[PDB]
Amino acid sequence: PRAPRTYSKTYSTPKRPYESSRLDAELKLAGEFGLKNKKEIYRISFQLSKIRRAARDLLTRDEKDPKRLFEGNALIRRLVRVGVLSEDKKKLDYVLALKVEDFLERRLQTQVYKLGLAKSVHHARVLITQRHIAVGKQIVNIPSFMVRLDSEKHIDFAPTSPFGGARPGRVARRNAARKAE
Amino acid sequence: ENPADKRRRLAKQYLENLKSEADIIASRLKEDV
Amino acid sequence: AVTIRTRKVISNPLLARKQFVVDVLHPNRANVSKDELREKLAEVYKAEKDAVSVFGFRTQFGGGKSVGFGLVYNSVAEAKKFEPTYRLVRYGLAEKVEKASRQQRKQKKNRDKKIFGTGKRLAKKVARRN
Amino acid sequence: ARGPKKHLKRLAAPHHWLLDKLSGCYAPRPSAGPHKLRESLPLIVFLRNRLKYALNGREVKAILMQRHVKVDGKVRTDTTYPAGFMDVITLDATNENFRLVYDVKGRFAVHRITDEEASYKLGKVKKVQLGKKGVPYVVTHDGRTIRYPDPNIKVNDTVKIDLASGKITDFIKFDAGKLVYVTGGRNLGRIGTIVHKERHDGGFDLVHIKDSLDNTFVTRLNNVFVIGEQGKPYISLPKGKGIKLSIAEERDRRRAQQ
Amino acid sequence: AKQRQTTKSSKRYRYSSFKARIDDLKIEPARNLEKRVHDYVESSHFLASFDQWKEINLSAKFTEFAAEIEHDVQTLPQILYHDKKIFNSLVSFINFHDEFSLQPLLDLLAQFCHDLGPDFLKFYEEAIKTLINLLDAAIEFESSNVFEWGFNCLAYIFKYLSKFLVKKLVLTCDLLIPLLSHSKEYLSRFSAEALSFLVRKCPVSNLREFVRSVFEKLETN
RNA sequence: GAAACUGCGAAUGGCUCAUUAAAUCAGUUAUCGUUUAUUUGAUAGUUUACAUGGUAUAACUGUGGUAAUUCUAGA
Numbered sequence: 001p002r003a004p005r006t007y008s009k010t011y012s013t014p015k016r017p018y019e020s021s022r023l024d025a026e027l028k029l030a031g032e033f034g035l036k037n038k039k040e041i042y043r044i045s046f047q048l049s050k051i052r053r054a055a056r057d058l059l060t061r062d063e064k065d066p067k068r069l070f071e072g073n074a075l076i077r078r079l080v081r082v083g084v085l086s087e088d089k090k091k092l093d094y095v096l097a098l099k100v101e102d103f104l105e106r107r108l109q110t111q112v113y114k115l116g117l118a119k120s121v122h123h124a125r126v127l128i129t130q131r132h133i134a135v136g137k138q139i140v141n142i143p144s145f146m147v148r149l150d151s152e153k154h155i156d157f158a159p160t161s162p163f164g165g166a167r168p169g170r171v172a173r174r175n176a177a178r179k180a181e
Numbered sequence: 182e183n184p185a186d187k188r189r190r191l192a193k194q195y196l197e198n199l200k201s202e203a204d205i206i207a208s209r210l211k212e213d214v
Numbered sequence: 215a216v217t218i219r220t221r222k223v224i225s226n227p228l229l230a231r232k233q234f235v236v237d238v239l240h241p242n243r244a245n246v247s248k249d250e251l252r253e254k255l256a257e258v259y260k261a262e263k264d265a266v267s268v269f270g271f272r273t274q275f276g277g278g279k280s281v282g283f284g285l286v287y288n289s290v291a292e293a294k295k296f297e298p299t300y301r302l303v304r305y306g307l308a309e310k311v312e313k314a315s316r317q318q319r320k321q322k323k324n325r326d327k328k329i330f331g332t333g334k335r336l337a338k339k340v341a342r343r344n
Numbered sequence: 345a346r347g348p349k350k351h352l353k354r355l356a357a358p359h360h361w362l363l364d365k366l367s368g369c370y371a372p373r374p375s376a377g378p379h380k381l382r383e384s385l386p387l388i389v390f391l392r393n394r395l396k397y398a399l400n401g402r403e404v405k406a407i408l409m410q411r412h413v414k415v416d417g418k419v420r421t422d423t424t425y426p427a428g429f430m431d432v433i434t435l436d437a438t439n440e441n442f443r444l445v446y447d448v449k450g451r452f453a454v455h456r457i458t459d460e461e462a463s464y465k466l467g468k469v470k471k472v473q474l475g476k477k478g479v480p481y482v483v484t485h486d487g488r489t490i491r492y493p494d495p496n497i498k499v500n501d502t503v504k505i506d507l508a509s510g511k512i513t514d515f516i517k518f519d520a521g522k523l524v525y526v527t528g529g530r531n532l533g534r535i536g537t538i539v540h541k542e543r544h545d546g547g548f549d550l551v552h553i554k555d556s557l558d559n560t561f562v563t564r565l566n567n568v569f570v571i572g573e574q575g576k577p578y579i580s581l582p583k584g585k586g587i588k589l590s591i592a593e594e595r596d597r598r599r600a601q602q
Numbered sequence: 603a604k605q606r607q608t609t610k611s612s613k614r615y616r617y618s619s620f621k622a623r624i625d626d627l628k629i630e631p632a633r634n635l636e637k638r639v640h641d642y643v644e645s646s647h648f649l650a651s652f653d654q655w656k657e658i659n660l661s662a663k664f665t666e667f668a669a670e671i672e673h674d675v676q677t678l679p680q681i682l683y684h685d686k687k688i689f690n691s692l693v694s695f696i697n698f699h700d701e702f703s704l705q706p707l708l709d710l711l712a713q714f715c716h717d718l719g720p721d722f723l724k725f726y727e728e729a730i731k732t733l734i735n736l737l738d739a740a741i742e743f744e745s746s747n748v749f750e751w752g753f754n755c756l757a758y759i760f761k762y763l764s765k766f767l768v769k770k771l772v773l774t775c776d777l778l779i780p781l782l783s784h785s786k787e788y789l790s791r792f793s794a795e796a797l798s799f800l801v802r803k804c805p806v807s808n809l810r811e812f813v814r815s816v817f818e819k820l821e822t823n
Numbered sequence: 824g825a826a827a828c829u830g831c832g833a834a835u836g837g838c839u840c841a842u843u844a845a846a847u848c849a850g851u852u853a854u855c856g857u858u859u860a861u862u863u864g865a866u867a868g869u870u871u872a873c874a875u876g877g878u879a880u881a882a883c884u885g886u887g888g889u890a891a892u893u894c895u896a897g898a
């Protein structure tokens with residue numbers, strides 16, 4: 001038979017789902033960033049845990065260790081590129097200091113809100129899922145899209161979007177036709 | 182008087198002009214491209 | 215308007231053709247038929263339409279551009295000689311061969327395997343017996 | 345099993361072929377030939393997955409049946425003909441000649457050569473023995489039997505074989521200070537100079553090899569192939585000249601050239 | 603063999619003998635209605651085919667020829683002024699008798715005549731002699747496609763120089779006597795067809811002189 | 824170019840884990856202890872000939888048996 005295709009889980013249930021403080025923090029995060037369910041928060045927590053565990057393991061090694069240098073440089077480069085880690089904080093120690101909110105900040109929904117295209121984070125999500133937002137020359141319909149530093153400046157309304165210079169949507173031309181009749 | 186012959190006549194006339202204005206003719210043809 | 219760009223162009227004398235990746239930018243249009251691209255590629259590369267083959271067109275997410283793989287043979291005879299039969303049928307250069315469904319052909323093969331020889335003698339024998 | 349196998353699953357195929365694991369279920373099984381199965385590159389993989397001339401196996405068969413591909417100056421038509429180390433692949437229509445040499449990463453590399461350098465090959469003398477009627481002969485790593493060798497030629501030496509006549513033009517003795525190429529193990533593809541041969545009677549001989557960067561490594565003698573004297577290789581070497589580069593330095597060079 | 607491949611097999615690929623390809627081959631370029639690159643032109647016929655043949659043919663000999671001549675064929679006035687060197691290189695490379703470069707060279711030789719035909723007349727004798735040697739060479743290495751290139755090259759030159767050759771056919775025939783008189787039947791057969799096209803394009807007055815000459819010659823093959 | 828003779832393949836592939844506790848299997852050795860279709864390279868002036876037989880038959884023609892089968896009998 002054909003060789004296997006690998007698959008993996010991108011989230012894991014927390015050690016204690018029932019902590020009141022954890023519930024309150026999840027509520028705050030979901031409301032602030034307009035997240036649909038707890039699965040998104042669990043996913044981002046899983047990723048951040050993976051990066052921080054890797055940072056711990058690399059820190060454990062002796063300094064100048066070639067594996068330490070190479071892997072730490074790669075991880076810091078990736079974190080700086082994705083925008084979570086600032087330019088001046090290129091040390092594994094500051095990688096270990098990251099928080100979930102930083103990753104939630106880079107989400108395309110939050111960025112679309114911040115740049116002024118939407119009046120609410122929920123409005124940003126609706127715009128994204130309705131094919132109105134384009135990164136560069138490309139339409140993206142995924143709120144969880146993680147925006148890079150280079151790509152943040154190219155977020156705009158899509159050319160095909162009615163808000164981006166295309167023809168009016170079905171409702172607009174329908175009403176215009178009815179008024180004309 | 183096929184179209185190819187017409188280009189020749191212009192080309193031959195063009196070469197005659199290049200000779201009249203004038204190695205030099207060779208270099209100028211390179212300058213054309 | 216529609217713009218066709220050819221990239222990663224390789225010249226294969228072994229198959230006597232030219233391989234490339236065709237990228238078609240088609241703003242404000244759903245996409246471009248294979249026939250129109252065949253015509254345009256034939257015009258650009260100065261060949262017969264019959265000598266141009268195109269396939270693998272997948273409009274990216276969000277529309278506006280298509281990417282696929284394109285072939286330009288040196289002359290039509292080579293195109294007929296090397297091109298797959300199915301792609302020739304798509305272009306009308308060749309006619310689809312009509313054949314029974316696989317199950318019928320396999321059953322006929324088995325029934326013929328059952329008989330030995332031409333079978334005329336068996337026919338005469340059964341005719342005489344009954 | 346009740347006989348020889350005729351199928352090769354993709355996962356079980358040699359790693360250095362670099363085959364997609366999801367394209368299909370089976371991989372080309374190299375037919376019997378001059379080179380061993382695991383140390384050979386079938387022509388299908390070379391024409392399709394390396395040169396990209398053919399898009400699929402059927403086009404490869406179409407190429408071969410046209411008699412455009414020559415291996416070692418002889419036309420081959422088998423899709424799975426096991427081309428290997430030091431074999432010359434000539435494609436006359438493209439006016440291209442290739443010699444199959446491992447790159448530093450350990451994979452067969454597309455190395456273009458001139459026609460003159462394509463006129464000959466190198467072979468490791470695997471055996472020297474008297475045949476019938478008292479005729480000495482030498483068997484090389486590619487299974488070529490050459491009669492009437494120069495008597496000084498001994499096992500593990502290198503012989504420069506002219507493809508047109510299949511005769512020895514010259515030979516190199518295996519001695520300290522000679523330039524050698526690694527053809528097996530984790531050090532596959534590296535180039536260096538011999539430093540010393542450790543001998544172990546009834547066991548596998550070991551050879552110490554010093555690279556141009558002064559790094560040293562030990563390899564079993566079966567994996568060493570003498571290719572010339574230091575600084576004077578008898579064949580053109582691929583890019584990198586068989587020098588192993590650390591991951592960090594590779595990163596630096598890649599970033600610089602980009 | 604008599605019972606030719608009259609009933610065709612279902613096979614897509616089938617062997618054909620060199621004699622078999624020669625028998626069905628026929629020298630008559632006009633019948634071929636396929637689009638020709640030189641039919642579409644911007645500067646000259648020579649350039650149009652030259653760029654195309656750079657793309658298709660990758661043979662070593664043709665590559666060297668292209669490099670030597672690439673600079674001098676960019677414009678039609680360039681070609682006319684440098685015609686002497688252009689013809690020399692074409693003849694020089696064709697002499698090597700390399701199959702892998704013959705096809706672009708024979709085509710470009712015809713298109714060269716197309717660009718400067720009346721000017722080709724001073725080159726006319728050298729061209730036919732070059733072709734005759736090529737065809738005579740081609741007998742040794744059996745390649746039906748080579749004969750197809752050479753005779754079509756002869757036909758194209760014969761097409762473009764129709765008016766001037768028609769005036770001096772007995773001279774043109776004189777060049778082709780070794781081909782027409784050659785021992786092999788097919789070489790005489792092909793040369794007859796290429797020469798025949800001029801015969802049809804004759805004024806009647808010129809034809810009678812031509813017919814007189816050949817009958818005079820008539821008094822091997 | 825049906826049928827048949829001839830050559831090659833059908834011992835690969837696919838499926839299952841019943842038996843199997845130094846057995847299988849993993850790593851590592853050996854054949855100076857042996858067979859090997861095929862591929863690749865070598866290799867055989869020493870054995871009516873303008874070329875020998877049925878010591879022979881298939882397919883095929885024709886005559887048949889059985890309720891029946893990838894049954895086959897005589898000429």
Ligand SMILES: [Mg+2]
Pocket residue numbers: 160
């Ligand atoms: Mg829309």
Ligand SMILES: [Mg+2]
Pocket residue numbers: 546547
């Ligand atoms: Mg031993």
Ligand SMILES: [Mg+2]
Pocket residue numbers: none
């Ligand atoms: Mg027990």
Ligand SMILES: [Mg+2]
Pocket residue numbers: 845
């Ligand atoms: Mg044991």
Ligand SMILES: [Mg+2]
Pocket residue numbers: 861
């Ligand atoms: Mg076999």
Ligand SMILES: [Mg+2]
Pocket residue numbers: none
């Ligand atoms: Mg053999």
Ligand SMILES: [Mg+2]
Pocket residue numbers: none
């Ligand atoms: Mg009988």
